[PDB]
Amino acid sequence: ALTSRTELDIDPDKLRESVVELLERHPLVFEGTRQLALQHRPEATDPWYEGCQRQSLISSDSDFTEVHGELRDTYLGEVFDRLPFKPIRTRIMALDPKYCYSVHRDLTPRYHLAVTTSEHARFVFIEHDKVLHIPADGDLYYVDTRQLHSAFNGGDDMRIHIVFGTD
Amino acid sequence: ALTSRTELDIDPDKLRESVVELLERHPLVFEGTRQLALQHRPEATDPWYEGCQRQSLISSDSDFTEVHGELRDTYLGEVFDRLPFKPIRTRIMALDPKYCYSVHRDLTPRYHLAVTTSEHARFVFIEHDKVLHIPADGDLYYVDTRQLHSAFNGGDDMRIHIVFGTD
Amino acid sequence: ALTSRTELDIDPDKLRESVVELLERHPLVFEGTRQLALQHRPEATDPWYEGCQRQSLISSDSDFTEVHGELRDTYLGEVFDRLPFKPIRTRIMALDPKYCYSVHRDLTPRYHLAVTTSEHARFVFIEHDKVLHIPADGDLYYVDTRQLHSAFNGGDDMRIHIVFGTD
Amino acid sequence: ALTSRTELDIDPDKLRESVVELLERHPLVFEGTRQLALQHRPEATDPWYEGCQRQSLISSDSDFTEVHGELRDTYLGEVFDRLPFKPIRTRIMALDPKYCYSVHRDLTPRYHLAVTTSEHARFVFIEHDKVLHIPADGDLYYVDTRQLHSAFNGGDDMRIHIVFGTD
Ligand SMILES: N[C@H](C(=O)O)[C@@H](O)CNCC(=O)O
Ligand SMILES: N[C@H](C(=O)O)[C@@H](O)CNCC(=O)O
Ligand SMILES: [Fe+3]
Ligand SMILES: [Fe+3]
Ligand SMILES: [Fe+3]
Ligand SMILES: [Fe+3]
Ligand SMILES: [Fe+3]
Ligand SMILES: [Fe+3]
Ligand SMILES: [Fe+3]
C-alpha cells in the first residue's frame, strides 16, 4: 500500500507547541526542504545537523540512532516513546511555502508525523495516479516514497513533518 | 469534461522558438507564475500586462479580445488562427522551477498549449484524484480549472504554457 | 556484583506523587508484601492483579509484557520509557511496616526502583555479609536476589518499590 | 567489642523446656516483641511485667535486681547461677514471625541466650555492615546494641531469647 496509519494518540496541539519551541532554540537549516536532525550518531560533534542531508549522493541512515537527550522531557520525546519501531535518522522535514519536489523515487520508505500542514500540502503518486494528504492528527503514516512521486506545499506556511527512518 | 485534447498540428519547436524570441523583447512579469498578456482590451494603454493583473482587478476575461498587432506576422499569429474557438485573455504563463500554487478553483476553464515542460510538471485535481501531464506536442489541452486543483513544476527549468480563455 | 545502579534521572518526588495517585485508584493486594501488577498478559481479563504472585510455586514471567494503557500519560509511564531493557511482570512491591522475609534465594534477579523508603528498609545478604539500602533517588538498582538473602522494613510506613523482571 | 561468646554449658533442650513451662503460667505481653520480666524491683507490685515497660518509663535497668522467687527451683535458677556477671532487668524477648524492628541504638549492651531460633533470625549492624546469628546452643552471646542495629525474624515461629542486662 502507498500509505498506512499507526495510531499514537499523540495530541497534535501539544505536539505543535513542542516543535515550535524546539525550533526557536534549534532552527531549521537549508531552504526548500528545511531540516533538523532529531537523532545523532554516538559522540556526535554536530548532533542537531549532521543527520540533515539533501545532496543527490545519499548516505546510510544506520549510525543516526541516539535521540537528543534534551528531548527527554519534551512532548516531542513522548512521540519517540510511543513508536512501534526503532527509528533511525529521524528529522524534522519542512516543505517551504509554494515549494515542490522533482518527480522521483527514494531508496527507502519513511514514516511521517505531520506537525503542521494545510489542504495545500500533498504527496502525488504518478503511476498510482493518487493524491494523498497527511493530516496533523497525532498519528503515524507510513508513506511508500519508493513509488514514483513528488510532494508539494501550495500554502503560505511551512509544512512541518517529523520523518522517521526504520531499522 | 475534465480534460480534452484537440489535435491542432502545431510544430512544438517553431512555437518554442517564437515564444523565446517574443520574450526577449517583452519579458515576463512577476515571480512564481510569470506572465505576459497576448491579448488586450481595445485601446488598452498597457496591452502586454493589463491582462496579467490579479483577479480582484479583472471583471471579465471577455474584455481582452485583441491579439497584439506585432504577432500578426509570427508563428504565434498562425497559432491564433488555428484555434477552433475564439480566444480571450490569452497569456503566457510560466511556472518557476520547484514552484507550485495553492489548491483552488478558477472562475473559468482554460486551454493549455505547453511550450516547454518536463516530466516534473503536472496538474493535480484533488477531488477527482487525477494527476495530469500536459506535453509540448503542439496540441491544445482543455483543463477544467474550475475543479479544485493545483499545478506544480518540480523541474529545474520554467514550465512555459500559453493559456487561452474562452466562452 | 550484588547491586548495580542505572541512572534514569527520574524525579523521585514526581514519581512518588504518581504512584500514590495510582494506588488510590488501583489498591495494593495481599499483606506483608503488597502488590499491584503494572504489566499484563495480552487480552488480560484481570490486568491489574494477575501478575501478582506470592505462593511458593513460582510461575513464569514471560507472558506479562503489556504495560497498562492508562499509565501512558502518567509520570509512572515515563519510568517505563527510560528503561534500558524490555521489562516483564513488573509489579509494585510494597513491604509492610515491621515486616521481613525468610532467608532464601530467588530464581531470578530483578531491578528495583525505590519509590518510598526509609533508613529502616534493607536487603540482608547472608553469605556476603552485606547490608544494602535502595534509596528513592530516581535510579534503577539491579539486586541479585539469587544470593541468599532477606529483606526487612523496620519503619512504620510501607516500603514501596517498583520491581522489574527482564527478558 | 561488637559481639562475644561465653561458653556456659547450658542444655538447650532443658532451657527450652523450662522456658515453655514458665510461659504457660506467665504469658508474654505485647505484639511484635513479646516480653516477660525475669527480674523485678525490690517490692514491685507487678514483678512479671514492670520491667517490660517502654524506655520512657524506666529510668535505669539497675533497679530490677531480684530474680523471681519461683525460679529458684527451676532450670532457669541455675541459668542465673552460671552467669559470670550480675544480671539486671532480665527479660524473655520473643520476636514474632515475619517481624523486625527499626534500626536504632539501645542505651546499654545486652547478653542474649537463644531459647528457640532458626536460620531466618538475625541481628544486623548497619554501620559495621555485619549480619549476626545467635544459635540456641546454650552459650551466652554479648551484643553491643548501642551500635546502630535491627533484628528480624523471617521464620514462621517466634524467636525466643532470654536477654540479660548488666553494668
Ligand atoms: N530526501 C529528499 C526529500 O524527501 O525531500 C529526496 O528524496 C528528494 N529531493 C527531490 C528534489 O531534489 O526535488
Ligand atoms: N517473590 C517473593 C519476594 O521477593 O517477596 C519471594 O522471593 C520471597 N518470599 C519470602 C517469604 O515467604 O518470606
Ligand atoms: Fe523523495
Ligand atoms: Fe486516480
Ligand atoms: Fe489555476
Ligand atoms: Fe514518555
Ligand atoms: Fe525473594
Ligand atoms: Fe560485612
Ligand atoms: Fe535493640
TrEMBL record, chains A, B, C, D:
Fe(3+) 3 binds at H104, D106, H149. Fe(3+) 1 binds at E78, D81. Gene3D superfamilies: B-lactam Antibiotic, Isopenicillin N Synthase, Chain. Transmembrane segments: none annotated. Fe(3+) 5 binds at D129. 2-oxoglutarate binds at Y101, R110, H112, R159. Fe(3+) 2 binds at H104, D106. Succinate binds at Y101, H112, R159. Keywords: Metal-binding. Fe(3+) 4 binds at D106, H149. InterPro entries: IPNS-like_sf. GO terms for molecular function: metal ion binding. This is Beta-hydroxylase.
